[model samples]
Target: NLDIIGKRIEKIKQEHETSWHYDQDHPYKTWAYHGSYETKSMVNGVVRLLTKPWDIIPMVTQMAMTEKVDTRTQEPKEGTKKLMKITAEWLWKELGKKKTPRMCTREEFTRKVRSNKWKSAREAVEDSGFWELVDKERNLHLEGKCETCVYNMMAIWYMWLGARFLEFEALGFLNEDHWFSRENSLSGVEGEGLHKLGYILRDVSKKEGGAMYADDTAGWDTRITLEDLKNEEMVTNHMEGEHKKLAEAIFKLTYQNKVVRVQRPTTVMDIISRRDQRGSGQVVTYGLNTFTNMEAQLIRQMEGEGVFKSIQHLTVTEEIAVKNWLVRVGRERLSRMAISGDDCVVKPLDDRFASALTALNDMGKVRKDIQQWEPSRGWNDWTQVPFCSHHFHELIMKDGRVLVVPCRNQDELIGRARISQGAGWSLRETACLGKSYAQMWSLMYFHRRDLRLAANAICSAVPSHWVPTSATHEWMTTEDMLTVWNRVWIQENPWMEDKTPVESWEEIPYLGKREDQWCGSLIGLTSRATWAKNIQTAINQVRSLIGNEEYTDYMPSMKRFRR
Candidate 1:
């Protein structure tokens, strides 16, 4: 295990110096030891110029270094013969003083010419008079040069011309074929094929003597063809087409303004209730919920009041009186007001109305004071659905006048006035209901502020079958009266309540759920007029029922009953 390795034996010599030493006799000895070997080599530098045919001059200097030459016949072997001939010519032109002409490098030539110096070899090459001699010699050289040599000389001249032209320069002799091609002529040396050739030349020149071309034919393999260009164009066109299609799709999908009529009854109700519930501190309910609650309360009250008794004892004639009353109060009011339209008149209920009327008559046995009446569903058959809150209010008001007044706050008052005006109520009529009505109208009153109580009280006083069962006949305060007034008169009812129905070609529906429940069945018997007419009729009927000589005291005194 302690034995030295084989290569280490040479490193044990203490007397010998390191083997890394220079050898002057074998100047490249280090390279040879490092795996370099002697090889035959040749170099050729040629320059040619062209003028007239008789004045062409081509100068070529070649040098060859080899192991030995034959010399028996004053000629070397084929390979060595070519080498020696080239070498001899090189030595004669480059070293032999008698045969060698004075020459200057390109830098010396330029400096001498720029400085107008004309004495040394550099001056001789730069002088205009000396260039005349050079021109003559160049012409002679051109005549003697080989075809490939002539081509290279012309290429070099063209390259010099292109360099001066800047934009059109062909980079090298190897690039000439590509640069001269039609596509290259249009796009310059940076054209595809020539650009690739430039990269190849850059890589090759980094090695020994650099790469070279024999003739233009040798580089033709690298030239790009028309088909290559067409393929590139195809790729570009495909991408552009895709972009255009995507752009069109994006444009088509962009949103635009479109009016959509939403069938959102719940949303509409919520908005209305929210507006009305402001400052009231009450949870809002909308749609059927609100109506159902009111209706249930009314039915209960009517039951407790004994309003539906004595129906079984009535004869057909007496029953007809109740039927006529329904027509007069319900259908007549709607018709006169033209809730549907002037041309569209209501007809009396058929046998269906009679049957409902009889049922109501039966209910009157349990509550004798309840009025017997029935409505016809035919009104709804030809009419638009009564969907708006104001529209429902108008239906209820056909039986009685509901009061409304203005509030103290100008903004709230103005808004309520606008709503009232939009509903077709006159400002004068609205003003008569006083500040409580106005507060309710403006939605500025609290629930306990007496508007709703007043409305409910008024609803209680009505002779109709609808009244809240849970409600007691407790003596109402002024505030209680106001509450009832707000809910029924100032808010829900349409006639004196600010909004009334306007008749059109369209028909109008009845008030209750079933035609037999309230006055809904009587619409057939009433003539359709405008809403204004119906309101007038309601006022007159209320006055007649109260036996008021003048209608002036009707509302003021009636409000007193709630208190």
Candidate 2:
């Protein structure tokens, strides 16, 4: 079985090492459900999944127990000991239950379906509950959707298989001559890189949420002071030498690996930093669920009270920098041990080869439709192509003319960018800002009271909780959000190279469709003549329209504000 799986992995890795796996059409396949009800169900399902955290304790312990080690010794290897404790605890806990839990709990199974984990799960339970609403004829209209879903499933399974290989290597189950045991295998010489990368990426994703709410001085103001070092040194001084060593080792393996990652700046800092920059360096990354449960349990167990108190004040980014420094210091200290004759050492893809392979999916474009998407990924010059951040997006022509495009939300903004890119327009990131056009727009509108009043009126119609607070700059008032949202939408008429015939938002019939009723309500708010009654009516309309939570679903921060 290992031979069959290993060979399958080898073939896959050789074929797609540097190539993209998901086709360009994969993104568009969702379009097949343009007006379908399935889209709505899937959206609700995903929102349910996003709001809850999966209980991964069982998954972690089960895999950790698979790691083989001798238990006869008075003391065991660190890995072996950690695994034994967790495994024993899990067994003891589960055995007490009326029915032993499954590999995936019932709740987890529900999430798996909602998350589209097992492709066949949908087909197997095809006509239960809401299944009667299925549009049989319409389903046949889009075969690509099924194919794309299959690709995603295949990719995830490959990832799972790779993790299994890591577990096997950790258990020393791989023979000396096994392909995965070789120097350049997916896990590397000792089978650790994939594990590390998974851990690093998971921590990075988790920690980035805090950075979004942080200010410019977040990581900068907090520094590793002499006092902190003194406290650290004082704490370590009286402990047993071996115990101190164990604590430091645990700190390195747990906190350093699980909590530290590249820093993400607040939206304010991101814009400010990019004000004078030449190009944006926004790279799209896929979130691979590589961090295993065993690693999480180990980190949780090792991070005791003392280490927690020490790192309490450090920003995620600062913690990373401090850890980096400490690692170098420890390495130097260990090198000196050779004077006492002691020694120290420190340490993608086969389709059949699936465990640790990650590739930039944007690296390839199908020849048939070259312009449908940005052919290259990461650090692309925003000035050269059309791009959009979550709130707003813009396009810049070769002639230096700028055009702001409007969309319902971030996902729509992306879809619009891809469409515009396909049509050969000029445009271009949490994504770093490359230029100052959008910055200038914000500055110009920053003090506009009329727009603010209009925004206030609209926000007043909705629930008071939907209004953002000063808690985080991202939690701006309705008026402030409108300025960003309507940046492009309110343009009335933007510049076009071929202004073949003079056209206005009023005269052009199609342009009327582009205008939102809210836009009219906003402009009407500035009417000093009509005044009170007009404003009240507008507010009523706004209230009625924004009543459903679905209206604010596009704004996740707003939902968070409500929470």
Candidate 3:
């Protein structure tokens, strides 16, 4: 049956090829049997710039609305089309001021001389010589002097004048009306610096304990001697239950200099030894299961020591400033530092210091398997919170001096230092334990490297040999911007006189180093502060003009634009 069907189809095709299907009278008949059609394949990839960007992306329209000529004045006799240009001319009549004319306004001016038939907005500005005035004001911003929106103006200069605007466009900062907005203008400073700046250390302390200081929240003072540990009995007297038992074991051992710390004190039972089975499965249990392998031992491993010392085990909290710690998103497992001393300063916990310390030497560590560690339910308050890895904590000992403990790597150290800054810990005074890694350097080292790469990329992407500066004839190389910006900042902020200058990017040791030193890259941030204020002004003005069209909707949010 299948073979006969195929033969019939072949016979039909042969008959069609031999016989004429169409008549001369009916020329529209099916003479051509084979079907003809057209098809196209397109990817519809990401668009960097639209053919007419201004049509979709809003520009500064405030000049058009605000600069409407007075109706009573019979200006140029163009019926119904009132004199919009006259009022704008008066507003921007003086180009020497700090404000630069918007692109649309300059374009309108260019159309007056050269008809709108051929010229684009950028070409119009160049032809009318209007860019010179704008460049003058922008150059002042680059000089880190004039309080104008430098970042946005810089984008405009690169795009309109430099013709490499596409590079900045790819950065996602200039998708919308960024120039006129107030908040958008100040973005460079408030956007990156504010969030990154340490507030917990300098902010007003409203807690029950005397005002919060770095030492109040961080590790033990380093001056503690062995005699200091033996003198105070009341510190260990507060220990109760399993906590009391473990303290005695460590204290007795310390007297004989057999051990400095006691970790994982287990008993020969199913309950006490079960806690050690989780997290890495390194357990010598002093208890057993039904099928029975002997699984109990009082494990005496002594490696990940905390930098600070205290009379009670300290718990790292997400309360004060730093909520996120490294790649560890939300803290699930809470742990106590393996530290308690006879002479450690023991203050009653305050509610204001909401999640500060556990204070009690309770039962040993318990791993938290559940994922969500919600704060409202008081999960961290649980005494059984496992001791965290020593790398992440500062162990404040009985003496007044603080020490920075060894962490796994530089990234881990950087993360903790940032967190510490958020928690009222000063970077200048804080030094890593027994190492030259200063806290400020730990925080600033990578940031400096990253800024250097960004600066290099910007320098390479644009072909310009020199950037505009305040001086009329003088020009500055793009490479000098960072150093010059820092110098200008130092000159402006005189109180920073105590902050000695260090070259571009280098580690500063806390010990025997200047108290508050400023790295060249760090001080470069001062320019951003001024730039942000100016950007904020422009963004607000633009926002006032366009009521509904959000700058955020068209452009990347400040969060995305920031470093």
Candidate 4:
């Protein structure tokens, strides 16, 4: 009986390792096999044992043979067969059918077995078998494999958990109050310093339990102090000086908090004329009268445009002027008016207003229209001149030779500059020299010919009137392209002696590798020769495309050259 059981077990192992999972629904009646014979039968048997009606017949028959016969001499054949059949029925009912059998190609099966799934499935199967099987020896082996597989899986799971823990700790999630408070508690730690400390603490506690301690005196304290100092310096130097300045400027402009005081020309003229009289002791007036009159005319023009009416409710200059006038009258009188005046009127101009004033002062030299306006008051609110327009117009008038005068705003000037810069022709004698470079670049980058074309197209699309003469001297011809190529080659390799006059190509030491048969070869005579020839062919093709025929007759004398 032991021998028969051993043989049966061996047969089961062999069959389980070789059989496939049969798919009944497939038109081709396909049987899915694993890469190895052992997994192949095991997969198929598991599936068949669940779905087939007579799957447990062999096991039932073996169990019945092991049972003892009754004391009555007559053998209980009917009862034994009935009991075997009942056992087979019960086993069949207990094993459930699979909804979808996993089908895998041989390559896929190999990958799966080597992956984590193999150990996982092995563990699960062992677990399920332990619960079902009553045999001691088989159960022991199953349980052993189960524990081994579980250990392997748990090791990987623990590794993943550790990695996640490290990530969370690095992000400062270990301390809930600090994370929620937006305090950036780990901001001063360097090179994962905080993370490393947390990890060590976690490890110590996990090993020793409760109130774990770690020595960090050697580097952590000193490094953290230095990092904090560096952060402070960075905030002072970069954030306070540069970023704060920029933020203040943006905020002033966006909020229109800057108050631009348009000084009346009459007032400025009076001051200037008085200064002139005081300095020279004469009635001599520098351009003060002219500037004053101009300022008046500009203000009148702005008034005519309904600008004053539009900003009447928001105007503060009249009130400020009245207050200043009152202050100049008498201290006692000024104090009485100040007591009655609204408190909002006496607020000092912030840095944002000062920046606007500086910008207005600089731009006012080139544009005198806003000479009387104070940049400290938001110029954007009162003025119609758009930002950047004045600068753009000035740049174009200074650089571009176009006779067209810029319109009132910066937008028109910027649009003109863009158009002029792109298409303007250079009137210089060397304007034609650019074609040589353009042609040479095209040949060198022939592999990406479209990109070359795009670059040339962009150059050509620029307005011709504004283009420098150097860009549009002449249309690039094929001969010009060839000349450029030859010049570039000579210029790049000045050490190489002129070999254009060599009688035969065979005399060239590295010419053989340029042949067609040696194509793609990296070394040896044939390869070197083929590479050189292929390069020459590509160059010639580019030359032909450009219509250059000067070098057309230059052909390889090797057997690979047909013409």
lDDT string for model 1 (77-181, tens) is 232222222222322222122221122233533553355335444445445665554444334323321111100011111111111111111111112223122
lDDT of every model, 2 decimals: 0.23, 0.23, 0.22, 0.23
Q: Which stretches of candidate 1 lie over 4 Å from their true place?
A: 1-390, 393-483, 486-563
* Per-model TM values vs. the true structure: 0.12, 0.20, 0.18, 0.13
Give candidate 2 misplaced runs (Cα > 4 Å): 1-368, 371-384, 388-455, 465-473, 476-535, 541-563
CA shift at 468, candidate 4, in angstroms? 9.4
Task: State the weakest 10-residue window (summed lDDT) of model 2.
Answer: 280-289
After superposing candidate 3, which stretches have Cα over 4 Å from the reference? 1-119, 124-482, 493-499, 503-563
- Which structure among the candidates has the greatest TM-score? 2
RMSD of each: 53.2, 25.6, 34.1, 42.1
- lDDT per residue (tens digit) for residues 401-471 in model 3: 22222223222332232221223322222211101222122232323332222222222222223232210
Better of 1 and 3 by lDDT: 1
Each model's total of backbone clashes: 72, 17, 37, 38
Model 4 stretches astray by more than 4 angstroms: 1-437, 443-479, 495-498, 501-563
